[PDB]
Amino acid sequence: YLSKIEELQLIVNDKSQNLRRLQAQRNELNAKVRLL
Amino acid sequence: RPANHRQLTFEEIAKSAKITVNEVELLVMKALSVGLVKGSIDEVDKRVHMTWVQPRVLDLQQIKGMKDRLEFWCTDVKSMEMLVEHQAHDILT
Amino acid sequence: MLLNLHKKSWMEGLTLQDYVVKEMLELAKNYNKAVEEEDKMTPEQLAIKNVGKQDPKRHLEEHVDVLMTSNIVQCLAAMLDTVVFK
Amino acid sequence: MSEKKQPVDEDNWDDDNVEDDFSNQLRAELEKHGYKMETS
Amino acid sequence: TIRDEIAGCIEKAYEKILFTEATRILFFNTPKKMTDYAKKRGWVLGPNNYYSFASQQQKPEDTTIPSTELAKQVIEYARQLEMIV
Amino acid sequence: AVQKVVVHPLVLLSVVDHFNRIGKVGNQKRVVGVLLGSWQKKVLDVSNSFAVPFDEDDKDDSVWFLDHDYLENMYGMFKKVNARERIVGWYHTGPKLHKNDIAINELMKRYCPNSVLVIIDVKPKDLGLPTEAYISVEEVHDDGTPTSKTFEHVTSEIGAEEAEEVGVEHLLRDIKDTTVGTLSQRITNQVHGLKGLNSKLLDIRSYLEKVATGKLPINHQIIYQLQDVFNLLPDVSLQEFVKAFYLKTNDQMVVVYLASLIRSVVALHNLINNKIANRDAEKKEG
Amino acid sequence: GIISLLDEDEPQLKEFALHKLNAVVNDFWAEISESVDKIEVLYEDEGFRSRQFAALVASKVFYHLGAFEESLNYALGAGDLFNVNDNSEYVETIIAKCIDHYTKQCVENADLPEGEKKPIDQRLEGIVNKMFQRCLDDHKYKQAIGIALETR
Amino acid sequence: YLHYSLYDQAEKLVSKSVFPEQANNNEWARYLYYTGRIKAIQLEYSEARRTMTNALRKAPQHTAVGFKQTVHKLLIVVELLLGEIPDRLQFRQPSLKRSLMPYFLLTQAVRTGNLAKFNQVLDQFGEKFQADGTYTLIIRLRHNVIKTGVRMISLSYSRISLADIAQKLQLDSPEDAEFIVAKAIRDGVIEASINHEKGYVQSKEMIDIYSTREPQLAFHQRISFCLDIHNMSVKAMRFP
Amino acid sequence: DLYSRYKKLQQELEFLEVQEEYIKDEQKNLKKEFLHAQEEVKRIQSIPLVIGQFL
């Protein structure tokens, strides 16, 4: 019963996703700074 | 003399100079007034202090000084420049 | 080759000839006091109340990068003795 | 707030440093000190 | 396990006798027991000096060569600045 | 006379374009040309140059051909369109000097007394510095020959001019001026350290090759005389700055106290703004 | 306080000692934690007749710590008690990570496909096909296809 | 376990998974309190003062019933064990006063050296602290006396004499005084060479803390802590 | 589906961790772009400016 709960452990992975999304937002900030 | 002794005695002056113990002050102050060396001598203990000087060749065709100082310095600052690179490895990023 | 001879000529220092190290730090500690007190006097008057007013005048105080890059220069140029020497 | 062990368990008070310094040391503060100069 | 710090400060062939401190080893004025102990495995300090004329600690007193390794600390400090920006 | 110059890379492309003229048709494989110079000050200035149709043979290595209509009346047309520009010297490729150099020196001196030629490279992937400058004087020798016109070197440098990079720096786009602190000085570090001590490895290597089989630098005794100028610091077996022991201590003193104090204040800058701005814009949930 | 008993080289009190080991093994975790060397003494012995259960009390102390290659070594030198004992979290966590070692071993076995691969204990795969007999008797198509392609 | 089992600090030593998350900081605070009681009973003091001052200053707590106070009293029992402690006026809440009715007279005994006060505070005022465990200071309250005295005299005097520092405090003899000079060093204290003929001691003050290399030996680590806080700023940005 | 779901969560993870790196690089790029914006626009300096009035 190793191959059940590793899937759950793959949400530590998903912490990189939030940081990814938010630095994508950070780039989106500078996008209209540079457009200005 | 193989430096790292530049502040030194006076008896080698009074021995090689064929001068006495007393007449080394005339010696050093007149030799500073000549203009081949410009270091202000520590006069309280007759201790020499020197500057720029004029050379008469090193070891027989400058082997030893050239190797053990010049190439030693070459690999010194070269390899520690590689160490600068080694710690500065990805600080260029 | 003009890229080479632009950041080799048109930016100063032909790279043998950069490695001002100290008198720039005398002037830079003049900087890092004079810039500092003005970085102090202003954000006392930030929105220390509970107002919902929305009209800023923009001056963007911060003064960080001058300190940062100038003192990286100061530390790695104070390195020059132990770097170029041995 | 029960932190699981601990529930089981300037009037005259800044001067206390000076006073605990001066408990058995110069307990009169002057009545020898004004009389020191004629001891010697 | 009674100790030897006075032998590590002032002893090693001469202090005439260190008898009047009740240290167990430092009794027995001169048999080969304390002569063996005054010459035991050398002279507990080690290099460059005896306690016939004491070092008063150990004689380290090296240099400021560690100005260069604090300069190394400066190098990786600037690296950590770059990692911080 | 000629000491340092001001040279703009229009001459450089004026080398490379005649290199495009004679490269694909390569038969004598060399770009040798004439350096027009707006001689203003003791510092020299160039804004124009042209490449002569030219050959140079190997046997007796003194056969060479200008084009004196292309040399005289082209220069006259140039003087009409720009009288400020006049002759100052010439240029060539093939950085190995040779025997015909002194012959074109003989002819370049009659046009301008303090003339200067330019050794170039067609592909500098160098340290680097750009192309070369000489000075032709007569020092004859300690030998007693008829006049020795041996090429003495002018330290070359580069200047600048308004509006001459407008499209080129636009095309490169890789321009990065303000980044000194990570890269722009470590390049110089790598460069002067490695590239100066390997030129010094050529010094010890070449001059120990002179020890073995070579000149063994007698009668130019300025070689080891100037290695004495290197030998201001002898560094004998304890590396001998134990008199700079306390001096280096007092040098570490100032900047490291600047480091401690100032970077603590830099923290006091960073942290407060970061925490306040983040806590505001984070707790505003909508 | 059992290294005092480990002074003895006769195993005829070491059976009583190992019965003490799995009795107060939850209390004396730092007892074995430096005694791993004497565990290797009784392990590498060819006359100590409990080197497998010495590898099991080694599995206890490196279950308190959680080491991987130690559990590989206990797959090696625990043998029968590594195989038949499988109804516990104490054993299924360490053999779960040993099945993880097996699936990266299968990664290795799919890295280079022509001979010359890394060596494989027959017991680290013995527990694979032994747990797979549970997958065959469980008969679920997950149980078939999963472990059938975990091995690649 | 400090009530009833005692093997397990060494099992913590192999069990010290550090857990640097410390999210509540309250559990971690009292965790430092328990292990500071341990290092007090492991007789580790110079570590205990900094880690237990840390454990106090990481308590944001309120409710002055005597939670922070009663935990803080046995916290600075390690400062009673240092040999040095200031006056405890900067530490008292008067709700703790009913419990510290031994403790103030005890720190009076610490600042003084009275054996009458020593034993009297022991027998009379040794109640309510055996429930916490206090009797390891009664063995070395004399050491506290001699270190307080030698601290005062040592920073007071460049040179002292031996057979008068044998009568500064309640000492015994010049052989006891040479004894207690060596035991006054005991770790690497300020220079005290005995004038080894008859001049009792030729001690002097030590120097070179001026501003030269020792502070800039430590400022790399000071700004190492500061760059750790810059990592805290980076994670402040990373919190969203 | 515990062989294929656990297959593809890894896949979409490694996808998004690649895709983070693009925007990390663009955030490295655009600060330089904004500095080039700053100085190469603020070369609007005194080309020989004329004196006038503001109304």
Curated annotation (Swiss-Prot), chain A:
<comment type="subunit">
    <text>Component of the 19S proteasome regulatory particle complex. The 26S proteasome consists of a 20S core particle (CP) and two 19S regulatory subunits (RP). The regulatory particle is made of a lid composed of 9 subunits, a base containing 6 ATPases including PSMC5 and few additional components. Component of a complex with USP49 and RUVBL1. Interacts with PRPF19. Interacts with TRIM5. Interacts with NDC80. Interacts with PAAF1. Interacts, in vitro, with the thyroid hormone receptor (in a thyroid hormone T3-dependent manner) and with retinoid X receptor (RXR). Interacts with ERCC6.</text>
</comment>
<comment type="function">
    <text>Component of the 26S proteasome, a multiprotein complex involved in the ATP-dependent degradation of ubiquitinated proteins. This complex plays a key role in the maintenance of protein homeostasis by removing misfolded or damaged proteins, which could impair cellular functions, and by removing proteins whose functions are no longer required. Therefore, the proteasome participates in numerous cellular processes, including cell cycle progression, apoptosis, or DNA damage repair.</text>
</comment>
<comment type="similarity">
    <text>Belongs to the AAA ATPase family.</text>
</comment>
<protein>
    <recommendedName>
        <fullName>26S proteasome regulatory subunit 8</fullName>
    </recommendedName>
</protein>
UniProtKB/Swiss-Prot annotation, chain C:
<protein>
    <recommendedName>
        <fullName>26S proteasome non-ATPase regulatory subunit 14</fullName>
    </recommendedName>
</protein>
<comment type="similarity">
    <text>Belongs to the peptidase M67A family. PSMD14 subfamily.</text>
</comment>
<feature type="modified residue" description="Phosphothreonine">
    <location>
        <position position="42"/>
    </location>
</feature>
<comment type="function">
    <text>Component of the 26S proteasome, a multiprotein complex involved in the ATP-dependent degradation of ubiquitinated proteins. This complex plays a key role in the maintenance of protein homeostasis by removing misfolded or damaged proteins, which could impair cellular functions, and by removing proteins whose functions are no longer required. Therefore, the proteasome participates in numerous cellular processes, including cell cycle progression, apoptosis, or DNA damage repair.</text>
</comment>
<comment type="subunit">
    <text>Component of the 19S proteasome regulatory particle complex. The 26S proteasome consists of a 20S core particle (CP) and two 19S regulatory subunits (RP). The regulatory particle is made of a lid composed of 9 subunits including PSMD4, a base containing 6 ATPases and few additional components. Within the complex, PSMD4 interacts with subunit PSMD7 through their respective MPN domain. Interacts with TXNL1.</text>
</comment>
<feature type="modified residue" description="Phosphoserine">
    <location>
        <position position="9"/>
    </location>
</feature>
From Swiss-Prot, chain E:
<protein>
    <recommendedName>
        <fullName>26S proteasome non-ATPase regulatory subunit 8</fullName>
    </recommendedName>
</protein>
<comment type="similarity">
    <text>Belongs to the proteasome subunit S14 family.</text>
</comment>
<comment type="function">
    <text>Component of the 26S proteasome, a multiprotein complex involved in the ATP-dependent degradation of ubiquitinated proteins. This complex plays a key role in the maintenance of protein homeostasis by removing misfolded or damaged proteins, which could impair cellular functions, and by removing proteins whose functions are no longer required. Therefore, the proteasome participates in numerous cellular processes, including cell cycle progression, apoptosis, or DNA damage repair.</text>
</comment>
<feature type="cross-link" description="Glycyl lysine isopeptide (Lys-Gly) (interchain with G-Cter in SUMO2)">
    <location>
        <position position="32"/>
    </location>
</feature>
<comment type="subunit">
    <text>Component of the 19S proteasome regulatory particle complex. The 26S proteasome consists of a 20S core particle (CP) and two 19S regulatory subunits (RP). The regulatory particle is made of a lid composed of 9 subunits including PSMD8, a base containing 6 ATPases and few additional components. Interacts with DDI2. Interacts with TASOR.</text>
</comment>
Swiss-Prot record, chain G:
<protein>
    <recommendedName>
        <fullName>26S proteasome non-ATPase regulatory subunit 1</fullName>
    </recommendedName>
</protein>
<comment type="function">
    <text>Component of the 26S proteasome, a multiprotein complex involved in the ATP-dependent degradation of ubiquitinated proteins. This complex plays a key role in the maintenance of protein homeostasis by removing misfolded or damaged proteins, which could impair cellular functions, and by removing proteins whose functions are no longer required. Therefore, the proteasome participates in numerous cellular processes, including cell cycle progression, apoptosis, or DNA damage repair.</text>
</comment>
<comment type="subunit">
    <text>Component of the 19S proteasome regulatory particle complex. The 26S proteasome consists of a 20S core particle (CP) and two 19S regulatory subunits (RP). The regulatory particle is made of a lid composed of 9 subunits, a base containing 6 ATPases and few additional components including PSMD1. Interacts with ADRM1. Interacts with ZFAND1.</text>
</comment>
<comment type="similarity">
    <text>Belongs to the proteasome subunit S1 family.</text>
</comment>
